[PDB]
Amino acid sequence: DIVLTQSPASLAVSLGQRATISCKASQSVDHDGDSYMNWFQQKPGQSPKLLIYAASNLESGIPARFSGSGSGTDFTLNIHPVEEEDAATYYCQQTNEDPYTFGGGTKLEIK
Amino acid sequence: QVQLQQSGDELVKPGASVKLSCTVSGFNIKDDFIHWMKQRPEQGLEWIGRIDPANGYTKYAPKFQDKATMTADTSSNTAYLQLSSLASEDAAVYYCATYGVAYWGQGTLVTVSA
Amino acid sequence: NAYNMSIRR
Structure with missing residues (x-):
């Protein structure tokens, strides 16, 4: 099976700055020239919300501040x-x- | 326009079974797989499997093969997750998803009593 | 297009 390891586990970021979250897969997730990696955002009490699909596609409704x-x-x-x-x-x-x-x-806080 | 409405939270006894529902509106469930996920605060998110409502075909993650039974009914546009022989480690929030995995239900909390 | 590419088909 594929293991996904994120870095960092948590971070606090200043309002207005850039942030990056890393995800490393234990084996490749590529097929036929595409990479099947999604990113989700979740807030307490709520379901995960899709941000990015197939590595770099921005989901409809999600601000372009997010990219993959x-x-x-x-x-x-x-x-x-x-x-x-x-x-x-x-x-x-x-x-x-x-x-x-x-x-x-990865838990993101705003300091 | 697509809504996945999951059933209410359940308190369940060890050894029992429970059946959770996911009622879809704004989308014909025959048109895509429905996926089920489990979430625990410590162990995180896990994919249980997917069902094709058009033909009833199912694929499970090995760790859920003897725990979960997915079914679906296109007529009522509802998918179900039955969990058997409940134990402490089954206490979790369970989600359904479709449209690839873009649209998710609100989650159903399962708590297991002592 | 998330339908087509958020899972491998």
């Missing part, structure tokens, strides 16, 4: 600039091979 990069085993989510409402836990998820798997989460 990477391929193979190495992926990043970038937030530019960070805003107050971005305090949440972020997860990566691969959907290239069964069973789908998720990273352990």
Whole structure:
């Protein structure tokens, strides 16, 4: 199965700055020239909300402050600039091979 | 326009079974897989499996093969997750999702009593 | 397009 490891586990970021969250897969999640990595945002009491799909596609309704990069085993989510409402836990998820798997989460706080 | 409405929270006894529902509106469930996820605060998010409502075909993660049974009914546009032989480690929030995995239900909390 | 690409089909 694919193991996803996120870095950092938590971070506090100044309002208006950039932030990056990393997700490393233990084996490649590429197929046919695409990379099947998603990013989700979750706030307490709420379901995960899809931000980015297939590594770099911005989901409808999500601000362009969010973007994704990477391929193979190495992926990043970038937030530019960070805003107050971005305090949440972020997860990566691969959907290239069964069973789908998720990273352990990164908790973002605004200091 | 797509809404996934999950059933209410459940308090369940060890050894029992429970059946959770996911009622979809604004979308014909025959049109896509429905996925189920489990979330615990310590162990995080896990994919249980997916069902194709058009033909009833299911695929589970190995760790859920003898715990979960997914079913679906296109007529009522509802998917179900039955969890058997409940134990402490089954206490979690359970989510359904569809449209690939873009649209999620609000979650159903399962608590297991002592 | 999340339908097509948020999972591998």
